[PDB]
Protein backbone atom coordinates (compact mmCIF):
# COMPACT_ATOMS: atom_id res chain seq x y z
CA UNK A 1 0.00 0.00 0.00
CA UNK A 2 1.17 3.50 -0.90
CA UNK A 3 -0.07 5.73 1.91
CA UNK A 4 -1.22 9.29 1.43
CA UNK A 5 0.57 11.87 3.56
CA UNK A 6 -2.37 12.66 5.85
CA UNK A 7 -3.47 9.03 5.53
CA UNK A 8 -0.34 7.74 7.24
CA UNK A 9 -0.42 10.62 9.72
CA UNK A 10 -3.81 9.51 11.04
CA UNK A 11 -2.69 5.88 10.86
CA UNK A 12 0.46 6.67 12.86
CA UNK A 13 -1.39 8.88 15.34
CA UNK A 14 -3.96 6.19 16.07
CA UNK A 15 -1.25 3.58 16.62
CA UNK A 16 0.63 5.69 19.16
CA UNK A 17 3.45 7.52 17.38
CA UNK A 18 2.57 11.18 17.94
CA UNK A 19 5.04 12.29 20.59
CA UNK A 20 6.15 8.72 21.23
CA UNK A 21 9.49 9.17 23.00
CA UNK A 22 9.10 12.90 22.45
CA UNK A 23 9.00 12.52 18.67
CA UNK A 24 6.16 14.59 17.20
CA UNK A 25 3.88 12.92 14.64
CA UNK A 26 5.66 14.91 11.95
CA UNK A 27 9.00 13.20 12.54
CA UNK A 28 7.52 9.76 11.87
CA UNK A 29 5.67 10.76 8.71
CA UNK A 30 8.81 12.56 7.54
CA UNK A 31 10.83 9.44 8.28
CA UNK A 32 8.35 7.17 6.50
CA UNK A 33 8.50 9.56 3.55
CA UNK A 34 12.26 9.37 3.06
CA UNK A 35 12.50 5.71 4.03
CA UNK A 36 9.70 4.12 2.03
CA UNK A 37 7.98 7.01 0.23
CA UNK A 38 4.83 6.06 2.16
CA UNK A 39 4.98 2.64 0.50
CA UNK A 40 4.29 -0.22 2.90
CA UNK A 41 5.80 -2.86 0.61
CA UNK A 42 9.18 -1.12 0.45
CA UNK A 43 12.15 -3.49 0.64
CA UNK A 44 15.75 -2.27 0.50
CA UNK A 45 18.74 -4.59 0.75
CA UNK A 46 21.57 -3.05 2.76
CA UNK A 47 25.25 -3.60 2.01
CA UNK A 48 25.75 -5.90 5.00
CA UNK A 49 23.26 -8.41 3.60
CA UNK A 50 20.32 -7.38 5.75
CA UNK A 51 17.15 -5.83 4.35
CA UNK A 52 14.96 -2.89 5.39
CA UNK A 53 11.24 -3.62 5.42
CA UNK A 54 8.10 -1.56 5.27
CA UNK A 55 6.84 1.95 5.83
CA UNK A 56 9.78 2.69 8.14
CA UNK A 57 12.44 0.46 6.56
CA UNK A 58 12.96 -1.69 9.64
CA UNK A 59 16.20 -3.69 9.44
CA UNK A 60 16.17 -7.49 9.42
CA UNK A 61 19.42 -7.89 11.35
CA UNK A 62 18.04 -6.61 14.62
CA UNK A 63 14.28 -6.36 14.43
CA UNK A 64 12.67 -8.92 12.11
CA UNK A 65 13.42 -12.30 10.53
CA UNK A 66 13.68 -12.77 6.77
CA UNK A 67 15.66 -16.00 7.10
CA UNK A 68 18.46 -14.63 4.92
CA UNK A 69 20.33 -12.48 7.43
CA UNK A 70 22.74 -14.50 9.62
CA UNK A 71 22.95 -13.06 13.12
CA UNK A 72 19.32 -12.02 12.77
CA UNK A 73 17.95 -10.99 16.13
CA UNK A 74 14.23 -10.67 15.40
CA UNK A 75 13.80 -8.49 18.49
CA UNK A 76 10.27 -7.51 17.47
CA UNK A 77 9.57 -11.23 17.01
CA UNK A 78 7.88 -10.91 13.61
CA UNK A 79 8.50 -12.05 10.03
CA UNK A 80 9.84 -9.18 7.91
CA UNK A 81 6.98 -9.78 5.48
CA UNK A 82 4.55 -8.68 8.20
CA UNK A 83 6.17 -5.26 7.98
CA UNK A 84 4.87 -4.93 4.41
CA UNK A 85 1.14 -5.23 5.11
CA UNK A 86 -1.25 -2.36 4.39
CA UNK A 87 -1.94 -2.42 8.12
CA UNK A 88 1.03 -0.58 9.64
CA UNK A 89 0.37 -2.02 13.11
CA UNK A 90 3.38 -4.35 12.99
CA UNK A 91 5.64 -1.57 11.71
CA UNK A 92 4.55 0.83 14.46
CA UNK A 93 4.78 -1.72 17.28
CA UNK A 94 8.34 -2.45 16.18
CA UNK A 95 9.22 1.19 15.51
CA UNK A 96 8.33 1.83 19.13
CA UNK A 97 10.94 -0.78 20.03
CA UNK A 98 13.45 0.74 17.61
CA UNK A 99 12.96 4.31 18.81
CA UNK A 100 13.33 3.08 22.39
CA UNK A 101 16.68 1.36 21.87
CA UNK A 102 18.43 4.49 23.10
CA UNK A 103 19.42 6.33 19.94
CA UNK A 104 15.81 7.26 19.22
CA UNK A 105 14.92 8.11 15.63
CA UNK A 106 18.63 8.32 14.78
CA UNK A 107 18.26 4.63 14.00
CA UNK A 108 16.58 5.77 10.79
CA UNK A 109 19.46 7.08 8.67
CA UNK A 110 17.01 9.00 6.47
CA UNK A 111 15.40 10.71 9.47
CA UNK A 112 18.70 11.94 10.91
CA UNK A 113 19.76 13.14 7.47
CA UNK A 114 16.52 14.52 6.03
CA UNK A 115 14.19 15.21 8.97
CA UNK A 116 16.19 15.92 12.13
CA UNK A 117 16.28 19.65 12.82
CA UNK A 118 13.86 20.38 9.99
CA UNK A 119 10.33 21.72 10.08
CA UNK A 120 8.66 18.33 10.52
CA UNK A 121 5.46 20.22 11.33
CA UNK A 122 4.93 20.62 7.58
CA UNK A 123 4.34 16.88 7.14
CA UNK A 124 1.06 17.07 9.04
CA UNK A 125 0.01 20.14 7.05
CA UNK A 126 -3.70 20.20 6.20
CA UNK A 127 -4.00 16.78 7.81
CA UNK A 128 -7.31 16.54 9.64
Amino acid sequence: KVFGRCELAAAMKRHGLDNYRGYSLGNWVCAAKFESNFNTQATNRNTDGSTDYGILQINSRWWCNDGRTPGSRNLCNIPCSALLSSDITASVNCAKKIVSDGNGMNAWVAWRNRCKGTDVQAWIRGCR
Side-chain angles (χ1 to χ4, degrees):
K1 185 183 162 53
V2 171
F3 268 83
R5 180 173 56 80
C6 294
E7 184 171 18
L8 173 68
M12 279 179 169
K13 193 177 191 184
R14 174 169 52 91
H15 281 103
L17 278 199
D18 56 308
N19 219 22
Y20 191 88
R21 293 271 173 173
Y23 291 103
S24 60
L25 186 51
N27 284 275
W28 296 100
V29 182
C30 183
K33 168 66 178 186
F34 298 130
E35 289 287 359
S36 67
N37 200 21
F38 301 137
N39 206 333
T40 59
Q41 312 180 78
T43 61
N44 285 309
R45 170 95 84 159
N46 304 129
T47 61
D48 57 350
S50 67
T51 308
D52 299 326
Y53 294 89
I55 202 77
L56 296 171
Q57 290 299 275
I58 294 186
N59 207 264
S60 51
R61 181 163 304 232
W62 281 99
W63 308 107
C64 67
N65 171 88
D66 53 10
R68 59 170 212 178
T69 313
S72 182
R73 295 297 298 263
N74 196 15
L75 288 181
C76 286
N77 193 29
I78 45 184
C80 294
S81 53
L83 298 172
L84 309 193
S85 56
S86 293
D87 195 342
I88 60 165
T89 290
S91 298
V92 175
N93 274 340
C94 184
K96 290 183 184 183
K97 285 185 176 59
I98 298 191
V99 82
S100 309
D101 197 42
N103 290 326
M105 291 209 62
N106 284 304
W108 288 274
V109 176
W111 178 88
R112 184 179 59 76
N113 294 335
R114 313 182 70 170
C115 299
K116 179 177 179 171
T118 68
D119 183 26
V120 295
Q121 159 264 326
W123 291 101
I124 54 175
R125 89 202 176 234
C127 292
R128 206 187 100 93

